[PDB]
Symmetry: C2
Subunit: 238 residues, 2 copies
């Protein structure tokens, strides 16, 4: 398949924006191609444009192994019934769409005009599916180690939340909504210090409202600590 | 977990017999331990004897990726629906038990006395589970490339049969039974030719009864051709 100008631009923007470069850019294009766009282009005579359905099929297996490996290695004392519970929760459409949105994945999808007109770019199923297809593309292009490099830290965090029975969602967005509603101002995040416990560098962030510290969260990155802080503040405020 | 004498001998034998040598033998031991054995040993004070249930949980995902990767790479034209159908069949208990039996896995399992007495060593589910657990052990000890090196060819063969809609089972044993019954002699497999056909070498095997050829089979190895010849002969002998 020969990428036309607008397709090449999108493919270039995706790599620049997400930082995920590809050796074979055709794998990336394919992962982002919803069937509605492949059908549209094929009907326009571009028979080599293909959907992400096959990559999604492989991607789901890549994801399952990636999540189960984290569970097996990180929770040796967990009952097998617990590994299975968490596995299902971690690989769910809900988590994947959340991950996709955080990556602004919707911006880079190729959709047929009708799908575009009817909200497909915001559809949880389409986003989750494209994310799985992306994992297969990265797996095929650069290997399983790259998948861990890009996503293990992020998923270890989601799996920890789920294993601990803590509800998982976009913490920062939820906290902002509740703080603006009750105080008419947004929450402020302050990195107050860093630590080096367990071997990893740890960021300590306090979330405050009107200068008052509501909660303190810790994480392996500034972003993660902010997320943790928002989770704690949200649960506390409620 | 310290391996006692009998556990040590089983582990050593497994490695010598299959040729799959482990850097970390505890992984191999755990894969071979059915819950009935672990529970029996724990109750007797050996608390570090663990079952293969966690390895099997990981092993199942290793198996799914292994089969899906083959399906994705080898059948680019297949509809996704065919890929999902073949995946389920390829990773099924039936196929996995067949594979386990080919590796004589049943002889290396650790089972509780009661479980062993009730026929556990021949139980399809126990065999399939330990094989998935073994895949996890090998994956953790030696890596994914070792899994392909050991099982890719074999699974590509099963996958091809299922993808073509051809029933999959122990062809040879099934043909043996039907030929022995009708003729009072067993079928014979004769490698009549080997050749390199734009890929690698391919063996041509003829299966015969009393010197008469019943069918011819081709494969990437002699054993594969023999299985193919038996499959063909068996289907034929339902004339």
């Amino acid at each position: 398949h020969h990428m036309n100008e607008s397709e090449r631009k999108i493919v270039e923007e995706f790599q620049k924006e997400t930082g995920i470069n590809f050796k074979n850019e055709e794998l990336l294009f394919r992962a982002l191609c919803h069937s509605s766009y492949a059908n549209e282009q094929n009907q326009a005579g571009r028979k080599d444009v293909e959907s992400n359905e096959k990559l999604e099929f492989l991607g789901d297996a890549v994801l399952e192994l990636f999540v189960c490996e984290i569970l097996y290695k990180k929770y040796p004392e967990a009952e097998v019934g617990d590994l299975a519970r968490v596995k299902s929760a971690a690989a769910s459409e809900e988590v994947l769409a959340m991950v996709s949105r955080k990556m602004n994945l919707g911006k880079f999808l190729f959709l047929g005009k009708g799908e575009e007109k009817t909200g497909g770019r915001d559809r949880d199923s389409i986003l989750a599916d494209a994310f799985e297809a992306l994992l297969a593309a990265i797996y095929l292009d650069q290997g399983y180690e790259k998948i861990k490099e890009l996503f293990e830290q992020e998923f270890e965090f989601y799996i920890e939340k789920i294993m601990k029975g803590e509800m998982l969602f976009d913490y920062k967005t939820a906290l902002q909504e509740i703080v603006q509603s009750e105080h008419k101002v947004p929450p402020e995040y302050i990195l107050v210090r860093t630590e080096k416990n367990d071997g990893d560098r740890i960021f300590v962030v306090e979330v405050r409202v009107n200068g008052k510290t509501i909660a303190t969260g810790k994480g392996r990155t500034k972003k993660e600590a902010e997320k943790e802080a928002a989770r704690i503040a949200y649960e506390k405020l409620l």
